[PDB]
């Protein structure tokens, strides 16, 4: 069965990660693509209910989130992950988990101890409308 | 359209074989089935866990949530479980009920024996017939 891919959105709270991810989801579902917004905050209620909010627990939450993304992508989904992921190592580990799974991984930086990504696939900035920004993610996936 | 979980339990009892053959037959019919293997999850998602009593319980708790997540995404989730104890199965069941996902317990007979499974698979049955019995349950 077909395999999906992951778009990982990193950036400070208030940078529009969840808004953009949700609009991309809607636009992809209209396309007939099984898109899915994977939010770590939701996972915290069930799967990840053992974790707290220490830095170590946040790293672990993200490590787990990257494996849930590869699992959903293995199941065919276009996974959209809005996660602050402030450390480069958070994003590097998620990238490595995807490489090992053979799942394509796109990093989108929603720009405003946050370590700024040097080489994202796409950098979004607040001049543009959320609709425009969503279309830029869509253009990235279709390129 | 929400999926469902089939939870296979038993001792070599043919659990992973029936789970795989059901997946294959469902995939041929255009049904999005998926075999969710706890040991595979231990190499990735659950790589933080050891093998203590508490760890084995946590591994099952997490597996049950992964199943509900996948079923919520529309998959028919097939779980060749290592869940010898009744309380294990009960926890998995409760997770599914709390999520509003239908849960089917399939006992691959040959450890606390299931008292009230949806289906009992008997070892005299050719594994084509066993998988077909599972599919018939799912299609009824």
Residue numbers in the entry:
A (entry chain A): 440 to 551, 582 to 612
B (entry chain B): 441 to 451, 453 to 551, 583 to 612
Paper text:
Alternatively, APS can be phosphorylated at the 3′-position by APS kinase (CysC) to generate 3′-phosphoadenosine 5′-phosphosulfate (PAPS), a substrate for sulfotransferases that catalyze the transfer of the sulfate group onto a variety of metabolites. The structure of CysC is characterized by the canonical α/β-purine nucleotide binding fold, consisting of a five-stranded parallel β-sheet which is flanked on both sides by two α-helices. Structural features typical of APS kinases of this fold family, including the P-loop required for ATP binding (residues 452–458 in CysC), the conserved LDGD motif (residues 477–480) and the lid region (residues 552–581) above the P-loop which closes upon substrate binding, are also found in CysC.
The Cys556Ala mutant also displayed activation upon addition of DTT, but to a lesser extent. Surprisingly amino acid replacement at position 556 resulted in mutants with severely impaired catalytic activity. Overall, the crystal structure of this mutant shows little alteration compared to the wild-type, as indicated by the r.m.s.d. of 0.5 Å over 143 equivalent Cα atoms after superposition with the crystal structure of the binary complex of wild-type enzyme. During structure refinement it became evident that an approximately 30 residue long segment (residues 552–581) in both chains of the asymmetric unit lack electron density and cannot be modeled, possibly due to loop disorder. This peptide stretch corresponds to the lid domain that closes over the active site cleft upon binding of the nucleotide ADP or AMP-PNP, respectively. Lid closure is essential to enzymatic activity and disturbance of the packing interactions of the lid with the protein core, even by a conservative cysteine to serine substitution, leads to the loss of enzymatic activity.
